[PDB]
Amino acid sequence: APQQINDIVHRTITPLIEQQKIPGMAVAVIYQGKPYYFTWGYADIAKKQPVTQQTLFELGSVSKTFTGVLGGDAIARGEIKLSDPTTKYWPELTAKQWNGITLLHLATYTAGGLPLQVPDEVKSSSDLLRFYQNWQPAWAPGTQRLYAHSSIGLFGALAVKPSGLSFEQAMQTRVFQPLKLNHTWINVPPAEEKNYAWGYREGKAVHVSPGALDAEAYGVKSTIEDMARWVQSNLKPLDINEKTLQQGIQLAQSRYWQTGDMYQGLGWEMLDWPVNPDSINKIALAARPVKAITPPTPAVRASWVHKTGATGGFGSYVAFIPEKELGIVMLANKNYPNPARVDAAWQILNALQ
């Protein structure tokens, strides 16, 4: 690899691993359209399995970027519209608090305070309906943003209904396969378990537990190679041959709402570039008023586009700058502080800017 990339990556990630006591980590830097890979440590401490370019990590909420793009693809196909009422796709959701709540609100966490977590008790399709029917919004729709797995999770489930496919089948056929993400999974097959890293929490090896809307909100597992390919696809959507997918990627990077210096896309979050680290998980719940961008701004090339993701034992981060054809993916099997992720990513991309 070019020595500049080698050096900034190693000088930034080594101290990170030491300070955060990360057991294993993979990093991909996309520079001028080409990916460069780096790995450290262990995928499985007890079995002494090293992290390799083929190791599967739990992406956690970085999964929301796949959901946002799958939703965008469905919009492009004319299957759904973000302006459609949630009830158009779930007529059984008859409680009155849902009048006025659109798919856009679900996709962008602006429905009025849907909670971060779907309760553990919610398992069956009937349990889920009961949960949403009983939910009482704290606010009118489209007034405040409260990041939530239950909001974009529902968006993902509803967005694939017109297709007739399960969320997983839709994601495989419409996003994973076309982009050749052949080692990206919602459910890790037995044949691939040898590559599935263990996550570590309080020193214990752990994997994400099954949960309602998990696939849609935080359940994707992937390798550093596939994630580099995902970043490349999002950096240059016009190179994608599938028309509705190219469009869906573009829609996921449109700016729908603004809170402070941040703009909410579908899954992706964006800030104008240049940006310094302070503007870009220590807070369990952060309610913020949002300003609608009427109409949404199409994907801005000069943007820092990113998403953090976690599961109990994993910490992921993806950021890219379209205008510079520059990006980075940091996958780790410890859920370490988000600021440390952003500070390292910024240190690396700014140096290569």
UniProtKB/Swiss-Prot annotation:
Effect of residue 218 to G: Increases activity about 180-fold with respect to cefotaxime. Reduces activity about 100-fold with respect to cephalothin. Reduces thermodynamic stability
Record has Hydrolase as a keyword: yes
Residues binding a beta-lactam: 61, 117, 147, 149, 310, 335
Family: Belongs to the class-C beta-lactamase family.
Subunit composition and interactions: Monomer.
PANTHER family: BETA-LACTAMASE-RELATED (PTHR46825:SF8), D-ALANYL-D-ALANINE-CARBOXYPEPTIDASE/ENDOPEPTIDASE AMPH (PTHR46825)
Protein name: Beta-lactamase
Organism annotation: Escherichia coli (strain K12)
Gene label: ampC
